[PDB]
Structure formats: C-alpha cells, structure tokens
Design an enzyme around this catalytic site. Structure first.
Site, PDB file in Angstrom:
ATOM      1  N   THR A  55       5.027  -7.499  -2.383  1.00  0.00           N
ATOM      2  CA  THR A  55       5.725  -6.863  -1.285  1.00  0.00           C
ATOM      3  C   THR A  55       4.824  -6.624  -0.082  1.00  0.00           C
ATOM      4  O   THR A  55       3.652  -6.211  -0.225  1.00  0.00           O
ATOM      5  CB  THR A  55       6.311  -5.540  -1.760  1.00  0.00           C
ATOM      6  OG1 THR A  55       7.677  -5.767  -2.104  1.00  0.00           O
ATOM      7  CG2 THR A  55       6.213  -4.396  -0.665  1.00  0.00           C
ATOM      8  N   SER A  56       5.361  -6.903   1.108  1.00  0.00           N
ATOM      9  CA  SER A  56       4.727  -6.417   2.316  1.00  0.00           C
ATOM     10  C   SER A  56       3.237  -6.822   2.344  1.00  0.00           C
ATOM     11  O   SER A  56       2.931  -8.008   2.244  1.00  0.00           O
ATOM     12  CB  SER A  56       4.895  -4.892   2.381  1.00  0.00           C
ATOM     13  OG  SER A  56       4.421  -4.402   3.620  1.00  0.00           O
ATOM     14  N   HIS A 103      13.499  -2.713   5.166  1.00  0.00           N
ATOM     15  CA  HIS A 103      12.221  -3.367   4.849  1.00  0.00           C
ATOM     16  C   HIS A 103      11.989  -3.653   3.329  1.00  0.00           C
ATOM     17  O   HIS A 103      11.073  -4.407   3.001  1.00  0.00           O
ATOM     18  CB  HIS A 103      11.080  -2.532   5.497  1.00  0.00           C
ATOM     19  CG  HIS A 103       9.675  -3.017   5.239  1.00  0.00           C
ATOM     20  ND1 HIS A 103       9.226  -4.273   5.599  1.00  0.00           N
ATOM     21  CD2 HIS A 103       8.595  -2.372   4.724  1.00  0.00           C
ATOM     22  CE1 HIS A 103       7.941  -4.387   5.293  1.00  0.00           C
ATOM     23  NE2 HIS A 103       7.534  -3.249   4.761  1.00  0.00           N
ATOM     24  N   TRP A 114       0.867  -1.192   0.000  1.00  0.00           N
ATOM     25  CA  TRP A 114       0.000   0.000   0.000  1.00  0.00           C
ATOM     26  C   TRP A 114       0.885   1.216   0.000  1.00  0.00           C
ATOM     27  O   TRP A 114       1.977   1.173   0.581  1.00  0.00           O
ATOM     28  CB  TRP A 114      -0.864   0.046   1.264  1.00  0.00           C
ATOM     29  CG  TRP A 114      -1.930  -0.991   1.290  1.00  0.00           C
ATOM     30  CD1 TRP A 114      -1.812  -2.286   1.731  1.00  0.00           C
ATOM     31  CD2 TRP A 114      -3.291  -0.834   0.851  1.00  0.00           C
ATOM     32  NE1 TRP A 114      -3.018  -2.945   1.588  1.00  0.00           N
ATOM     33  CE2 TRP A 114      -3.942  -2.078   1.056  1.00  0.00           C
ATOM     34  CE3 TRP A 114      -4.030   0.245   0.314  1.00  0.00           C
ATOM     35  CZ2 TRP A 114      -5.301  -2.277   0.745  1.00  0.00           C
ATOM     36  CZ3 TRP A 114      -5.374   0.042  -0.010  1.00  0.00           C
ATOM     37  CH2 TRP A 114      -5.995  -1.208   0.204  1.00  0.00           C
ATOM     38  N   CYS A 115       0.443   2.282  -0.651  1.00  0.00           N
ATOM     39  CA  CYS A 115       1.218   3.506  -0.647  1.00  0.00           C
ATOM     40  C   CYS A 115       2.602   3.346  -1.252  1.00  0.00           C
ATOM     41  O   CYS A 115       3.561   4.028  -0.827  1.00  0.00           O
ATOM     42  CB  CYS A 115       1.361   4.001   0.774  1.00  0.00           C
ATOM     43  SG  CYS A 115      -0.184   4.645   1.351  1.00  0.00           S
ATOM     44  N   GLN A 116       2.700   2.426  -2.217  1.00  0.00           N
ATOM     45  CA  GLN A 116       3.913   2.213  -3.005  1.00  0.00           C
ATOM     46  C   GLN A 116       3.626   2.151  -4.503  1.00  0.00           C
ATOM     47  O   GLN A 116       2.462   2.073  -4.973  1.00  0.00           O
ATOM     48  CB  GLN A 116       4.632   0.936  -2.626  1.00  0.00           C
ATOM     49  CG  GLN A 116       5.640   1.092  -1.581  1.00  0.00           C
ATOM     50  CD  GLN A 116       5.816  -0.224  -0.842  1.00  0.00           C
ATOM     51  OE1 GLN A 116       4.927  -1.077  -0.893  1.00  0.00           O
ATOM     52  NE2 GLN A 116       6.973  -0.417  -0.176  1.00  0.00           N
TER      53      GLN A 116
END
Length: 263
Positions: free
Chosen positions: A94-95, A244, A30-32
């Site tokens: 990712t993440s 991260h 999110w937010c990437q």
C-alpha cells in the site's frame, strides 16, 4: 498475534489461510497496520496463505529502537521470508509501502518473484504533496500536516471503516513515526524522482499491477493508461472509489484484482 522477530527488532504479524498454499504478503504504508487489510484478508484466505506484517515500530507495542531507512524495512521483510523458510511468494503493498515492495523485487530476482502489486502509490509527486511532506515533519505541528493528508485521503466518504482507520489506527501512532514517515517518503522521491522512474530503472521488470482510486484526477488516470501503452510490464487498475485505501473502501473489488492478476 503471531510475532517472529527479524534483524534489529520485531514485527507482530497475522496469518490467515492454508500455509501450504500460494503465499501472499499484505504490506501496509507508514503509520498503518495489518488492520488496513481487515476487509481484504479474510477474502484472500480462500486461495492464498496470507501474511499481514506490522512494520518496525508499528506493532501493538509500538516499539522504538533507532530510526531507520525505507531500505532497512526491506531488510526486515527479507529476514522474514528466510526466517520462516519461504521460497515461493508474492506481495501486495500500500501507498509508500511500495518503495519497500519494489526494493525487494530488486534485491531478490525478477526470475524469483516475476509479479507484484501496489495499491494507491502516487506515481508522480506534485506541489501540494511536497508541502504536506514538509508540514508533516514540523516538530510542534506535525498533526496539522498529518491532518492535511486525512482531509484529502478521506474525500467525501461516509465509509465507516475508512473513517475508523483515519481516526483510530493512523493517528494513534506517535508523532516521531509520523515524521520518520515524511522524511523517508520525502527522501525516496528525491532519490528516484517518482515511483515511475524507480520502476523504469529496475534491470529486469516484473509484471507490476497498480490498483488505485486516488488522486481523483482524470489527467492521472490518463497518465497511467499512457504509461502502460508504452511499457507492457505495467498494468493499472482503477477502482472508482473516492478514497486513498481501496482495500478498506472496496475490498470486493481489490480481492478480485489480486486474484486475477496473481494467476
């Protein structure tokens, strides 16, 4: 760049490589952005057909529309594969993009996609985390909650590209996205308990490879070695970064792992 639209809205997406080669999706948190993959993608453009999409609201036009579930983002991507006509493909996420990844592994076959990769997904929540998810949603001080993660995610790096990321990519998105992200991530933990429980509850399990540097915990590194000794569909790979975003901090390492797992 290239931007087919799906379901409720659009997502701009980059394409790199020979289209008639093994197709591989690079999916962010999110937010990437697809810029998370800026170092890793040109490497994988040798072997794979590489698509880096931009989640709802994450395009260069940061487009609103209704708020949405982590489950509609899935729906997005499913209307993607179809819209472009792509039967054979893999994904690397990712993440908290991984929640989406696993949803698709569950929505489509295991038979269909027998393998998947996730990067730096926190396999088990902890008190610190739950807090930052709350700090995160605070209408007036969401920034301080955003910032909390950054200080953490960044650790002690001098890394030009990671620093640039958490100064120019992520904080650039709107507070209303930072917040949706927290509600959503928060929601998923509450549903499944953890990424590990999520995965353990698929009816048919792909081979799953977790690439990751953070959290910088020997216990945690040991927890995976141990999960894996009990569950042979699981394949942790620790890159020794301090960060991260192993795709930014250590693209050579990540590329080799993707290459090797995916064949």
């Amino acid at each position: 760049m290239q931007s087919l639209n799906v379901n409720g809205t659009l997502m701009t997406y980059s394409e790199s490589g020979d289209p008639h080669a093994p197709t591989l999706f690079l999916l962010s948190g999110w937010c990437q952005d697809h810029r998370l993959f800026k170092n890793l993608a040109p490497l994988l453009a040798r072997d794979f057909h590489v698509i880096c999409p931009d989640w709802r609201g994450h395009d260069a036009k940061q487009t609103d529309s209704g708020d949405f579930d982590s489950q509609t983002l899935a729906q997005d991507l499913l209307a993607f594969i179809d819209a472009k006509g792509i039967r054979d493909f893999q994904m690397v996420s990712t993440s908290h993009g991984c929640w989406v990844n696993i949803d698709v592994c569950e929505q489509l076959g295991a038979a269909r996609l027998p393998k998947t990769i996730i990067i730096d997904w926190l396999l088990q929540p902890h008190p610190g985390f739950w807090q930052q998810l709350a700090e995160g949603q605070h209408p007036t001080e969401y920034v301080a909650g955003r910032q909390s993660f950054f200080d953490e995610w960044a650790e002690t790096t001098d890394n030009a590209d990671v620093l640039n990321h958490l100064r120019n990519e992520m904080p650039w998105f709107h507070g209303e996205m930072w917040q949706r992200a927290c509600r959503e991530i928060e929601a998923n933990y509450r549903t499944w308990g953890s990424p590990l429980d999520r995965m353990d509850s698929l009816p048919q399990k792909p081979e799953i490879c977790h690439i990751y540097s953070q959290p910088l915990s020997q216990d945690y590194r040991q927890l995976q070695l141990e999960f894996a000794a009990g569950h042979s569909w699981f394949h942790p790979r620790h890159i020794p970064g301090r960060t991260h975003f192993p795709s930014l901090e250590n693209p050579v390492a990540v590329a080799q792992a993707i290459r090797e797992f995916l064949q």
